[PDB]
């Protein structure tokens, strides 16, 4: 409790001219005293954070200059890290829904953990991405260097992967409602497009598919019982 | 010229299993013999290419997996090297029109020659740009790392620097139309903005703007005789 109060004193002082350390010092100890759900010290100039509160459900902490996270206390629900220069980040808690990571320089995520629902985590530098967990719902990862993709789960409904290097696209599940894929290095696509909801949002412009894949598809999409999605694509 | 056909043989010879330098090889071939205007190794797996042939002024090579580029003939007037994991450009053609490297791990540009109209630069590593030439066009920058930006030259139409740092953004030329500035840190605008043609079309939603900005915004505009463009922003 005062082991809060002691850390956050002694980095208040530790600082470079331009950061609000000051205000953040005052959110800090308001947020343990009346041990609010919500800590809010985005826009501040941080280049570091010290121990945070341990009772917090969200983290917002975009627009800052972290470069690290300290460790995330076990309670966390949301955490908004977008806009950061973060070059990785610590082991992220099981009670973990949702995570904002987009446009830092992550070259690796953690492991992924199981109550994971949306991951937003655009315009960074991952090669790879770990296994998803069983409830993801949401998934954007555009802007990055992914050359591959690890297979989908189950509940997958939105997916967003523009501006990578795939080559290979995995079996699309059922659920997926929205597959934003442009600008990859597809030249097939996954049988299983063609079996998402007919009001199902495909896009892979951008993909040199091959004229194999494209004599395929437009056999089956002009077919008079074709009960698939609409899918938009490019040429030239 | 043999010089060119035995360095291409002794390049052809000296390659990993998956790169396609014999595709590769027989498109310099043709491209020297015919005097092609275009030289065109997209989507053909290389990590390197040899010396180019000298007459070419259009150079593709988009989706490969080049890290330095070598020499550019001094006829270039196109680049198209999108899709690679560029480091670094080599000095630019005095000719070059047109560059579109896009996608790559550039951290700085090199000096960008006079005839430049067409720059196309997003999702790279750019912390600086160099100084902008007199005839530029069309400048996408978004998805880097920009803190700042240089002046803007008075023919440009298009900007688009979305998702990245910058915190002041310079005056605007009367010649822009399109101003494509979201998720920035911009908290004000330049006065020049109001200054558009009134059909120009201005994003900066996703700007942490003031509220001084905003009210001040929200006096000129609903004016009766507001002459300047409409202005997408966002809250929340």
Chains 1, 2 share one sequence.
Not at 77 to 93: D, G
Request: proline fraction near 10%; glycine fraction near 4%.
């Amino acid at each position: 409790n005062e082991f809060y109060l002691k850390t956050w004193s002694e980095w208040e002082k530790n600082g470079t001219p331009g950061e609000q350390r000051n205000i953040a010092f005052n959110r800090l100890k308001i947020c343990l005293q009346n041990q609010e759900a919500e800590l809010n010290l985005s826009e501040l100039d941080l280049k570091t954070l010290p121990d945070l509160p341990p009772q917090i459900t969200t983290l917002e902490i975009r627009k800052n200059l972290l470069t690290h996270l300290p460790d995330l206390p076990p309670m966390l629900k949301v955490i908004h890290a977008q806009f950061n220069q973060l070059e990785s980040l610590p082991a992220l808690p099981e009670t973990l829904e949702e995570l904002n990571a987009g446009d830092n320089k992550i070259k690796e995520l953690p492991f992924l953990p199981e109550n994971l629902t949306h991951l937003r985590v655009h315009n960074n530098r991952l090669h790879i991405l770990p296994l998803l967990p069983p409830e993801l719902k949401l998934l954007v990862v555009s802007g990055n260097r992914l050359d591959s993709i690890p297979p989908f789960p189950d509940k997958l409904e939105g997916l967003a992967l523009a501006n990578n290097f795939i080559e290979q696209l995995p079996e699309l599940p059922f659920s997926m409602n929205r597959a934003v894929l442009m600008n990859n290095n597809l030249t097939t696509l996954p049988e299983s497009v063609l079996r998402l909801a007919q009001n199902a949002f495909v896009n892979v412009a951008g993909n040199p598919l091959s004229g194999h894949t494209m004599r395929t598809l437009q056999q089956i999409t002009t077919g008079p019982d074709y009960s698939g999605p609409r899918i938009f694509f490019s040429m030239g």
